Amino acid sequence: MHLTPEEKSAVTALWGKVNVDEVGGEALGRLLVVYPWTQRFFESFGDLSTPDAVMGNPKVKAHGKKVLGAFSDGLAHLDNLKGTFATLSELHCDKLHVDGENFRLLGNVLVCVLAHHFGKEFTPPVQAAYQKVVAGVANALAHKYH
Amino acid sequence: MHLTPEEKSAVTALWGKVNVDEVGGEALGRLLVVYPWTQRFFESFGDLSTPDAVMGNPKVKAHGKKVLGAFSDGLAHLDNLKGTFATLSELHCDKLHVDGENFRLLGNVLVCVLAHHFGKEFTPPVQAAYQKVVAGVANALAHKYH
Amino acid sequence: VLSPADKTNVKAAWGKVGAHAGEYGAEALERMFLSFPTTKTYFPHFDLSHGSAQVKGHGKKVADALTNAVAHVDDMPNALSALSDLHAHKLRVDPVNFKLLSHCLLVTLAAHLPAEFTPAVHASLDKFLASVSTVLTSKYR
Amino acid sequence: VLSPADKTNVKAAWGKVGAHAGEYGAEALERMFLSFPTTKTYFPHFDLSHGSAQVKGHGKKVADALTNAVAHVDDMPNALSALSDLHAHKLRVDPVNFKLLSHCLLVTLAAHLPAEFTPAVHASLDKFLASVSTVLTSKYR
C-alpha cells in the first residue's frame, strides 16, 4: 500500500476495536438496501424486499461476516493485497461473475458503517487512511479479471 | 501497466504513424468542445465560443502539440511513467491546479481521435492496449497530487 | 438536455449508419469486452469468442434500441420505458457500465464515419448516449 | 426519483441536523480534501488548513443550500437554478466531484446521527444527494 506508518497505525488501531460479526452483517446489508441492484447475486438468500427483511436476513448477516473476515485477514498483508487476494480475485471473476465495481460500492459502504459505529473516533485523517485501504482492496480483488 | 509484450508492440507500431502536431491539436480541441467545463483552464486562449473557434485557435493547436509531445515521450518509457511524469505531475497539482479527472477525459478523447484517424486499423485489441496506456499515463500524472 | 442542433447532429450521423447499425453494435460490444473485462461478468452465458453469433445477435438488439431512441428523440423516456424496467428489475447492470459501452460506441462510429465524426457531432453523440444511459438507469432505485 | 418515503426520511434526518448544519458542512469539506486531494484543485485561493475560517464559511454556505433543497425537495430544479448556473458557467467543477462530496456528507451524518442513520435513511439521503448532484450539473453542456 501507499500507507504512511502513521496511516498504517491508524487503520490497525481502529480495526482492533471492530466487531467483524456486527460490522460485516451491517455493511453487506446496507449494500443491498442503498444499491438494490447488488441483490442480483443473492437471490437464494430469501426475502430482501425491505430494509428490514435484508437487515434481518441471517444468510446476509452470515455472508457479511465471511466477507469482512477475508477483509480482516487482508489487513495483515497491506504490503501485498495483490498476492493476498489473487485466489479470491480469480474466484470472483471466473466462478461468481461479480462486477469489480461492486468492490468499490462495498468499500464506501464500509466507511459509512465505521463512521456510524465510531462517531467521534472516525476523524477525517482516519477516514483518509481507510479510503486508501478500501481502494487498495477493491483493486486487488479485480486484479485477476480477464 | 499490464502491457503484454504484444500490447506494447501494437501501441508502438501505430504510434509510428501518428502526426503528433495534428493529433495533439485535434485531441485538445475536441476535449474543450465535448466537455466545455475543461475550458476553465484556458481563458487566456481567446475565443472558444464555438467549435470552429476552438479547433482553429492557434493557441489550442500549439498547446495540444506540447501536451502530445510530453505524451509521446511517455510512450518511450512505458516502464517508468511515474518517474517520467513526476515533475509534470507536481506542476499540474501545485501550479496549474488541474483536477486529475481531466487526464482521464483527455485519454478517452485521444482514443476517439486515434479511431477517427486509423479507421479499421484501430482494432478492438489495439484499442484495449491504448486503453491501458492512457490510464497508465493518467495515473502517472496524478501520482504527485496531495 | 439535447438542443435542436444536437438532435439534427444525431439524426444525421445515425442516418449514415443505416444498415450497418447491427454490425456497429456488435463491434462496440467486442471493443467493450476487450478493453473493460469486468463488463463480461454480465454475459456468463454468452460465447464471447470473435464472431460469436450471440454477440452478433445482441449487437443488433442494442442497435435497434438506439435506432428507436433516435426515431423518438423527443420522447425518449417513453420510447425506452420497457428497456428501462428490464435493466432496473431483471438485468440490474451497475450504472457505470453504461458509460463504458457509450465510450465504445463512440469509438466504433469514429472508426466508421470519419467524414461525419466532426467535433460538433462527437459532442452531440456523447450527450445523446449519456441521455439514453440516464433513461435506462432511471428506475434503479 | 425521490419517493414520498425518501422525502420524509430526508426531511427527518435533516431536521435533526439543526443548528449544526454549518459545522457538518465544514466537516464534510475537510474529509473530502483529506480523502480526495484532487478536490483541492478548486480551492487554490483558500487556506485549507484545519479550522480555517474560509473552510468554515464555505461549509455554512453549502449546508444552507442543502437546507433550501430539503425545503423545496418537490421543486429542486427551481430552488437551485442560480446554483446550477454558477456551477455550470462560472466554477465548472468536474461532475465526478459531486459524488465525492456526497460521500463525505454521508460519512459525516453517520458519525453524528447514529440513531437516525438507519439503512432506509442512508438509502434516501444517498438518492437525495444524487438528485442534488444531477440538478447542479444539469446545465453543464
Ligand code: HEM
Ligand atoms: C471486500 C470485498 C470482498 C471480499 C473480501 C469478499 C470475499 C469473499 C469470500 C471470502 C467468499 C467465500 C467464497 C469461497 O471461499 O468459496 C466470497 C463469496 C462470494 N462473494 Fe465476495 N467478497 C467481497 C465482495 C463481494 C461483493 C461486493 C459481492 C456482491 C455484492 C460479492 C459476492 C459474493 C458472492 C455471491 C459470493 C458467493 C457466496 C455463496 O457461495 O453464496 N463479494 N466473497
Ligand code: HEM
Ligand atoms: C496527457 C496528459 C497531459 C500532458 C502530458 C500534459 C503536458 C503539459 C505540458 C508539457 C505543459 C507545459 C509545461 C509548462 O508550462 O512548463 C502543460 C501545461 C498545461 N497543461 Fe497539461 N498536460 C496534460 C493534460 C492536461 C489537461 C487534460 C489539461 C486541462 C484540461 C491540462 C492543462 C494544462 C495547462 C492549463 C497548462 C498551462 C498552459 C499555459 O502555458 O498557460 N493539461 N501540460
Ligand code: HEM
Ligand atoms: C445504451 C446502452 C444499452 C442499450 C441500448 C441496451 C439495450 C438492450 C436490449 C435491446 C436488450 C435485449 C432485451 C430483449 O431481450 O429484448 C438488452 C439486453 C441485455 N443487456 Fe442491455 N443495453 C444497454 C446497456 C447495457 C450494458 C452497459 C450492459 C452490461 C455491461 C447490458 C447488459 C445486458 C444484458 C446482460 C442483457 C441480456 C442479454 C441476453 O441474455 O440476451 N446492457 N440490452
Ligand code: HEM
Ligand atoms: C452537494 C453539492 C454542492 C452544493 C450544494 C454546493 C453549493 C455551493 C454554494 C452554496 C456555493 C456558494 C455560492 C456563493 O458563493 O454565493 C458554492 C460555491 C463553490 N462551490 Fe459548490 N456546492 C456543491 C458541490 C461542489 C463541489 C463538489 C465542488 C468542488 C469539489 C464545489 C466547488 C465550489 C467552489 C470552488 C465554490 C466557490 C468558493 C469560493 O470561491 O468561495 N462545489 N457551492
